[model samples]
Target: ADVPAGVQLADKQTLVRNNGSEVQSLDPHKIEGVPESNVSRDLFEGLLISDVEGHPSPGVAEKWENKDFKVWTFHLRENAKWSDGTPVTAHDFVYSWQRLADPNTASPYASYLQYGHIANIDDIIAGKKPATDLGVKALDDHTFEVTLSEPVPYFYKLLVHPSVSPVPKSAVEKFGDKWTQPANIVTNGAYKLKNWVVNERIVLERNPQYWDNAKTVINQVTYLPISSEVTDVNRYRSGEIDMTYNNMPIELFQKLKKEIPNEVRVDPYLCTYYYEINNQKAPFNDVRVRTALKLALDRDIIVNKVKNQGDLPAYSYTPPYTDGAKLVEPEWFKWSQQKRNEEAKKLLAEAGFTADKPLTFDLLYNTSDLHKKLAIAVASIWKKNLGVNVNLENQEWKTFLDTRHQGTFDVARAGWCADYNEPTSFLNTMLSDSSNNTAHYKSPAFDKLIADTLKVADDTQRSELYAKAEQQLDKDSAIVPVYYYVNARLVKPWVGGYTGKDPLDNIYVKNLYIIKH
Candidate 1:
């Protein structure tokens, strides 16, 4: 039986994806990792959802409008319901936003709303005001209102982050942090939590009560936290998985692409891979030392030879594709590799390190084949170019996050993906007060530029401010910008409706179907 495209439909409407890492937390507010978000997208829908191309699409809120980009109102779908058949209301959204800013909740993304300029959010997070003082309110059961301190041009895109997804207050109040457990969870997305085995697999089945359930095709979805990129590809080829993680094995890419050209997908992703230098530490605290390391590494080789996956060398934190942003080319970016290497040695010598007394530090990365390969190449480049001694350390995903947060490593692998399609999504992570600022980078000038961007509604002026912020970052050498990312993975040919067009790489099972091969 042929379908509309002359393809047969499979009997099983199920999908299994490799998530690359175990989730840190199921609670959207508490999570700070990509893997956690992958599951959250299925279990919960925010006010505005993402289309296949990562654009804002309707979710719980069927329609929304803004006034001067400072005040916004949303009209929730009348038929929206929780997994348990409870009506999804604007009040729930209000409570969820409040919880995210409540000091008791201690959400890592508490500062996210501050980026949106939500009224009173900063004061509430600072303990000056109560959580109830947040600018979100429910005018009625289905109408939600939001007041921002200033205008935000990309406000709708910001809503797509899982941090803003509405939570069931009853579940949280009843189970506390345990509310996200499979037995206690309540979800409003197309799927509901079915089972979660720590470090193994998390499963979701279609939610019949979802507002758009009739249109969703996939019945069940499972996410496997497979940390090894090599194993992920192997399992996918063996039919044990339907898709692989983005961390595909670099060495095997060409072979796989050549053998199964239809299944291999490589698309441009808005992510920057970098090394977070501990600016608060002794040796790294020196700007010359930091710049020396940054200049010595050959990013062209890393992207073309080491990664060899169609990635671009990154000289700035924000990717070139970011909306209303410009690419920053530093003064050193134009220098030849040999000239840069000479400057690096001179800077290192000035920093009190000579050929005999070499600079030494450990580079930390999570357990992944791609990271290991990249780290080794980076260490070798630094060693050969600047005569620096680098020790490589690997940790599991969760422990790696804790280590980075605690500043236990000298330098660590860090990557940032656009939470939204804006430049601020990448720049804000390095702000002085950002919870995600693992590098401890601080600059009064940079802070002022970001603060200025919040006050302006003009796209061109705001973009100029963002450019200055990125330039300041480059001048400071706060982090070693290595390369921009490309999402590379093997998706089964039978997975219909699959698209790698989303730069964020947020996949929705609701938009997928299984085709008979």
Candidate 2:
């Protein structure tokens, strides 16, 4: 059944989530974080998309194969068409890949493709050659080939993302500066963007000409970017919207968990929220100072007091239950109160700081009541345990990100939600010496492990290699791991078919058929 012609709604944007707080635009070529990526995934379609189990399934490319591990070939679906009725072809994929690799465009994830068969992409982006010469090409209107610099086991999974989605050349040429704006955007996905009001609301209507329009069950859907817990709860109660995610306050979650456990759902997310120390800067240049700061954190207290609602405390980079298994820590539980105190003192001493020598630094966080509480708790712990004087600098989401991008702070809180279900999605992108390495922490040894892992076809060997990489990161304390994220969503009975497959939490409306009362 189709929804009525007119519906006005309110939705929240990054209400309580740490990453993906601000989404500037909807272009798949420029999307950086989960917030924007989620929106892009819904408004666009990639060559392939992940199944429930995280393996790649057919999407725009109806069939694909690798004649050699280095060369990936894709055959476009003949019936695929844009909302405007134009054919979606292999040429579009070629154009999109070229646009993403264009040096002038500057995509942060471009460097993430630097290992295995795609290593030459970095040099191409660096002006060594034209994007056409890099490796991707179209053999005909229906077929395309992607020759990598090396073998990549996760390459198929990576293609199941917006980063590899097709972009229409006609739309870019016709709309020019207006492309991706509300009035001019073109879509070849299951849904089309009806409206987008920054920080307020976004609407998606069923794509009438979509290749799989018959299977895209939902007729219309809306996104209300509400940022307040009280506002979201009130809206849900008032029956204004059908679903809510990652915005429930601790008090609200506790109150509702008992009242409606089925409607209010919480599950561990494949993400780790943490703080990063600027290894390039002053006191943080001292590993001992960094170690002292890590020791000062009471992770369990922060999770209980500020986060609440069963959010798991984290001690490692990879979150629990990622890759279909929980991360085990042999030495984590052994750190006792006395050991923590002693470790803090030892690190402080190594950094040449004592009870009399006060080490001062600024701690940056996004402005929120919960964040402020967390910061204060961490600050108090540092002051008591390490005699470190920490100052808090709070900013709105956009400002906070800008500061981090400019490398303006000594220490800042930041994190990455898994782009795909793979560990490399988090490790290589954020921790490796790529452009996305916000903390500027680099190690050749770490990069080598990541490279070798991609070549290991055996599942056990691959898992072990990724684990070794993670263990190295833990030892280096590349980033302070506070807690693994468990995404919570509040939904009404009318809203159904929401799935965990979308790591970005984009609601797929095609499978959402409203039940008639």
Candidate 3:
């Protein structure tokens, strides 16, 4: 057999992947979505990186240690070099982290260090102290130190986040925002950006300067901004793509699984799909209205019949796989659809909406056939069971992100993939001041529970606090939990090293090779 289609062994070792959407931004500190972060992984290297199996391994840092979970020290790899062959150092990390907290950077993830319990980060972001006053320090050229305000047992896991990726301070200062462009970008990873054609493709080539370049098999990686899973499947079948996005057309999932059993992959994933309600907006502001809408949806039909790909129904945000946490749900989760509808009607009536004055709101979702199908189905269930009026809206991925973050939508489709294997990764999003808290749900009781987890040293005590926070969210009806995500995808048989063992579903090109068919 000759080389398979979509493989370029003759010219260069290349791998083509479906990115699903145009990246929001290339800047590690500015990006948010999964697609953007995937690209960032190739263009930059954090202190620690997730291996093929999703275990935290050495990256720029050769080794690390912690003192009583409050102080951490890292030893950078002396051979770790930027794309331009400059040595990566601890000073670069200090500058990069401080820039994230600088008001002028205006990063949406500015509170990330605060969530990680870094000392003085909250004050720096709040303008009460200088950014340089934050707790990270450069002890020497290759040694970095971090001081946290409290003990966090999971601090090592947090190091793999994109928000903590080190940047070249000289480049940022020289080129300003243009430092991320292909021409100016200096990456510290296995690959470097070669070109980016908006809405078409982003190309990366092996970085000869990388410390592990000799072992890297794939020489070039191309990411296509193909949003539709159906189209992704079509391309894959046509020999134009090597991989499909995390989903295929729902109706065709079973047929494809039978047709290409080896190519189709379904892996356990850690994520939640939900509709983010604007708690600050009228009607949704009322607990009765919010609770009624949350109760009316029949999650069973949505998973078993509509999506039909073995997704678990979710009545809570944090998945069971999260470390040191117990999954909690509302009381209505055990009720039948008929009983839920009865309660929904009573709650709507109590909120001053009757047959004449019906409950109505706009449901906004990003432009994807899968999202459209789910939104239409969920809205119809509300209409049929609760006599509610729903107007559906769809926007392109970028525009939809702007609308959701600007708080312009009544209800927006949202999904959160964990940044780490910790409960705080999801629960922290409910904090009143969290940049990722699109729901705008704020309760002192909920906030206190999360804040306490960082300070508590005992695992059992921390788990109890996590359960309390989840229970508080159930009482508040913060967001409508739809389902837990599963990594339903397609990979070409020629593509090697796809273990699909990570609950995060992170794929690294450096670990993959193209085998001759």
Candidate 4:
């Protein structure tokens, strides 16, 4: 009944992990999904890395100091080297960060740098200034200093973000965009990209040249991109994989918990799974229509039935237990299930849509058998309760993202996993000018509330301001917050050092290894 140890060592001891979805990119600056995030720490580390508790610790930068809240300095580990044996230096970070901020790079996450303390990030991203003008410089081979436009209290936490990873400039210049190819890649983390068979599996081998190589126990990791929850669960049941980062059917996870309590875990993740309406387009632009969509679905049924995982029905963008998030949940969010069911029909009628006039829209989602199932539930609920005709379209992940950005769909699948533990991290995605604002909803009041957060450094006051923004999201029906995720996994008992919680979930896997019973 126990999961068996898979194979290898002396050099290639492997920890096989079941992952869902194809990674859109291997380049840290361009990747956004959790699949990529899982591989990120293994291949490229940032200045700081988050521990099991999501606390920041020195990574590439062995030591760091803040000067008067505006200037920061980091001393790189002198012995650090890339997988190719190139010295990892302060200039490597300078090149990588500037490449991310450069307008021509068109990194969708450039706005994320502004949230961190990248000075003149706005002007640099807007093309008004050169990437060289960005306020980061290497004082020497090992010393890097960055000057911010203002003080950021959690600057170190931001360094843990995947987008902030350093890249070897020589490798990038030599290989260009193909630098991430398995044959050309150079990494400064615990592992190096060894082989990639897209849609099949990714192989990573231990980096003998990493600064902390002595302590990194795992020799290799194999990530299999499984598309179905059922397939991953089957693989786990058969002991084909040592663990899974993929989401399983609540029904299956619940069954497994009783059967193999030692290997199953369900913990809090700072993520929100939601349905995004294209506010730039037609019927969804109507506030009444947006409200109707939110109200029609019985969140209780969806969470308890479709996803029996310990997922909470989301009332706000940020989940309840997250820091400073529960300070002020919208009062209207507490309405009874039946009360919402009644109000939903009234809203649909008010929006000038009825069975006779019927509202119709396309629901687009990426290639997740899980997403398709959620989409099916949504369409059924909307059609049965609100007389809305929904067409479900499922595309590959990259194609879906492109269409979502192009604003071609009526309502689409979207989710936000926190960059850090802050309401601003979730709320900023809805900001009018925020490029990640895929929903295309805009409100000056909501925008100002988020902007005001940077000015209010006190945690309590910032919470109050963010609460107002959260309410605006609900009132304007900017996006429908569906469920707060529980980080679910089936990790074997033999796998050590895997923390399945929040931003820190399983990323410090360099220390993860198997011990035979």
Quick one: best lDDT, which candidate?
1
Q: What TM-score goes with each of the models?
A: 0.98, 0.89, 0.97, 0.95
Q: Report residue 271 deviation for candidate 1 (angstroms).
A: 0.3
Highest TM-score scorer = 1
Give the per-residue lDDT digits (tens) of candidate 2, residues 1-517. Answer: 2334453222311111122244656788776666666567667888886554346678788998895577889898889888889988888888888887778767765664563346368678679887876677789888988888767656777776677788778888898757987678889888788877776677777788888787665666666655455566767767776666464565467888888878886655777778888877877777777776776687877888766867787777777567633345736435875677678788788878866778888999875555666678888877887778889999866667667767789888776777667777777764445767778777777888877875667777777777778777767666787887777877776554555555545444554555442
**All candidates' lDDT scores?**
0.89, 0.71, 0.87, 0.81
lDDT for residue 330 in candidate 4, whole number 0-100: 64
Q: Write the per-residue lDDT of candidate 4 for residues 59-81, one digit (tens) a residue.
A: 88889999866799999988989
Best of the two (2, 4) by lDDT: 4
Query: Can you give the lDDT of residue 213 in candidate 2?
Result: 87
**What TM-score does prediction 2 earn?**
0.89
Error of 2 at 286 (Å): 1.6
Reference-based TM-score, model 4: 0.95
Model 3, 1-517: lDDT tens digits are 1233576543357889998899888889998888998888887898999988899889889999999888999999899999999999999999999999888888888878878788998888888999999899999999999999988778888888888998888888899989988899899988999999899999999999988887788898999998888898899999989988785687578899889999999888999998899998998999999888888989999988899887899988998777676766666898898898899889999999988989889999988879989999999999998889999998988888888778898988889999998899899889988888889888888998898876667888888888888888888888889998988889998887788999887677888888776
Q: Which ranges of candidate 4 are over 4 A from the true structure?
A: 1-12, 501-506
Clashing residue pairs in candidate 1 (N, C-alpha, C atoms within 3 angstroms): none
What is the Å distance of residue 365 in model 4 from its true position?
1.9
Assess the local accuracy of residue 346 in candidate 1 as a C-alpha lDDT between 0 and 100. 92
Angstrom error at residue 415, model 3: 0.5
Ranking by lDDT: 1, 3, 4, 2
